[PDB]
Design a protein around this ligand. Structure first.
Ligand SMILES: *CC(=O)Nc1cc(C)on1
Length: 225
């Protein structure tokens, strides 16, 4: 369980911040709203890995929702082609992601899904697919990211340097784009060491979330309500 942990009680993370009044206060407050957490490895890939595992975990046993997600995943090669990626170069990454979606349908266990996401090879192939899809989605909608996010930014350079490469950290743009690309609704809870209110953001605004993440020390962990 080196990439995605077993579930633990929320208060188990007090030990990561001993004798810190603000982190203790915020973790205690968090525990009033969430019961359990899974930790993810801090290797620069943790957003993609956490969102992938947690969303597919949320689909287990839901036959209509699996059928609709599989239908969307079958179309994602066309998003990659339209942004200029070549099939022979994304084939290995696409096939790894389609495979774990079929596992959710056919096997349907938590234990089998957690084994794929802790397999360094399968798991890294899944993360690389998610990063190429994020890049394609932004490239194909460059005017939307310039209109709504930053009129001055260089979209192609941003995708090349801060989305495609393994171990590159995410910001709001990547979270928004991968949410939109796979129709995944998520809520991110923010715990920093400033003396402020515990707070959260929903992607997209006003959706009912599938996935809850905790963002703390530049790390995304998985929450359960
Ligand atoms: C999400 C992610 O990988 N975060 C992170 C923090 C540190 C340290 O390394 N990676």
């Amino acid at each position: 369980f080196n990439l995605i942990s077993e579930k633990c009680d929320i208060l188990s993370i007090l030990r990561d911040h001993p004798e810190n009044r603000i982190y203790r206060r915020k973790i205690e407050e968090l525990s009033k709203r969430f019961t359990a957490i899974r930790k993810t490895k801090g290797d620069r890939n943790c957003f993609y890995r956490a969102l992938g595992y947690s969303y597919l975990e949320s689909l287990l046993g839901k036959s209509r929702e699996i059928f609709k997600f599989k239908e969307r995943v079958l179309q994602t090669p066309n998003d990659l082609l339209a942004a200029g990626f070549e099939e022979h170069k994304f084939r290995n990454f696409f096939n790894a992601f389609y495979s774990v979606v079929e596992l959710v349908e056919k096997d349907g266990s938590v234990s089998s899904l957690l084994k794929v996401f802790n397999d360094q090879s399968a798991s890294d192939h899944i993360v690389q697919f998610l990063r190429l899809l994020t890049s394609a989605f932004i490239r194909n909608r460059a005017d939307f990211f310039r209109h709504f996010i930053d009129e001055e930014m260089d979209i192609k350079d941003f995708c090349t340097h801060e989305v495609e490469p393994m171990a590159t950290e995410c910001d709001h743009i990547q979270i928004t784009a991968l949410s939109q690309a796979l129709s995944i609704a998520l809520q991110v809870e923010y715990v920093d060491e400033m003396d402020t209110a515990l707070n959260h953001h929903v992607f997209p605004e006003a959706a009912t979330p599938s996935v809850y993440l905790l963002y703390k020390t530049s790390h995304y962990n998985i929450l359960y309500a």
